[PDB]
């Protein structure tokens, strides 16, 4: 049990690095591995990694989470934030097991909106043990040479003592890279669902069949291990309308069809929390489309976001 | 980490009974509960509970595991061994989320045989992290007033250092009743698959979202904790499918009382000893359920673990 994700993250990293149960190479990828590893987070909202050596990218974090909420399988959206992700796209325009959006909101086994069913289930029976969103699909193993098989099995939500608790079940997780965005996204969905239901946030449990550090990340992992402000709360109630507007801005900014000044960002008809997210996308637009870094944009952000930007793009925001 | 399932079972039962995290009533069923609970078993073949006050039923345990291997959703098969399982059947004919057989061998999503796909995946890439059998299905929550939603999410197998390791992921598990048969069946599947692949048996990991004791079982759970050996036999090496097919033939004939076998007939069956003993369990159960003469010579030839289970479960017949 840990207070924040960062504590759990570093502890797990040091477990796998120092005492791997196995060294092997699934699909030719040499790794240090532990089996059946998990942890419990007391404050899932504190979901960010702030160790400068890790250079955690809060823009990608929100982008992935919102990509999931959009229900999209499209590569163009997500690869703009994570260029290496195209390696998992067979067709060069969609992602398959990597795209959790369709798994949540239109699962290929029946075309089911599981999020809605979870909400209904917990509304009809608050104590329910059945409120599960399945991610993995039985057909992913049926075809050979599949380059993108879902590594998350399911996400479960439970209301306990008036608080929404979350559990992520994974068959496999990159403990150094992927875990950072996976735990961010799962706890983001947990918080989002809690606000929708009018509940407080409980604990988050993470459990994984194979947790591993790829040997190709060993140097960077070592640098993070040698190294050594609060994440803001999402506003109460139904955030879908705000998410819809944020997604409109995301696309306009990503395609460089529009740009927002510090004053224009503050003028947006959005809660402060979501204004800052759009601000992250404007900052990312400045990077990607080589536009002038706005220091006034930077100064208005929550400190956690300022730090992430300054460390990730020090030439722009340092 | 525990050596045997009994050690893990008793430790967990004590945790939930005496130190529950929550008290609630999902679907109106008052319970003591802990969230995010699991264990590791170093010796998954030792999968049985022998505490007399628990009255663990080894015949049901094998019947459930074989019911799964048969790929069947039929109620008639399984309710013969566990009459109370009828409560989860909406049609009096089949089970839905309780029936893991079809989920494994012809999953609702595509009709996929996931066991075959797991074996192929591990054959092509021994180190694979992908060898998962999905159990749960997204349509189960879309069924209005569903009385039988799968509580197992998935089973995963990994080949590590020449051993097959197993992981059972469940959204919910009854710590008193269900856990006994679930861990039996999952470790049975694990062993069966290891033998088929020519591997030794690795660790078994059990991971559960909600682990609970129902208040209706509190008195019995207390008797077990207040009350608190011989080894469980190993399944033969190699491909056991042919033996399983033969055992399922005998299972059907004995259950329907369409056949019966004496102790000497059982001993002379053309099966490995391990599987002969399982057929004998079914013959013993037939004697009980169809009111035939108990064969004490049958009882005497069984492994001690099975003798004990029969003696405690049916003391009037085998005590
Ligand atoms: N969300 C994810 N988390 C992750 O940790 N991964 C990583 O990508 C790997 C996919 O390779 P396998 O299908 O061989 O497990 C996982 O083992 C895991 O290390 C991938 C995704 C999907 O992009
Ligand atoms: N294999 C099983 N193990 C189990 O432990 N169960 C128990 O049956 C309950 C089913 O009710 P829910 O769908 O409300 O979780 C589970 O919570 C669990 O307590 C049921 C089955 C299938 O009949």
Author numbering:
A (entry chain B): 5 to 232, 240 to 329
B (entry chain A): 5 to 232, 239 to 329
Quote the original article.
We previously demonstrated that MilA, a CMP hydroxymethylase in the mildiomycin biosynthetic gene cluster in Streptomyces rimofaciens ZJU5119, can convert CMP to hmCMP12. MilA and CH are akin to the superfamily of thymidylate synthases (TS), which transfers a methyl group from CH2THF to dUMP to form dTMP in the de novo thymidylate synthesis pathway and, hence, DNA synthesis.
Subsequently, the structures of MilA‒CMP, MilA‒dCMP and MilA‒hmCMP complexes were refined to 1.65 Å, 2.10 Å and 1.80 Å resolution, respectively. The electron density for residues 305–308 was poor in the structure of apo MilA but resolved clearly in the structures of all the MilA‒substrate complexes.
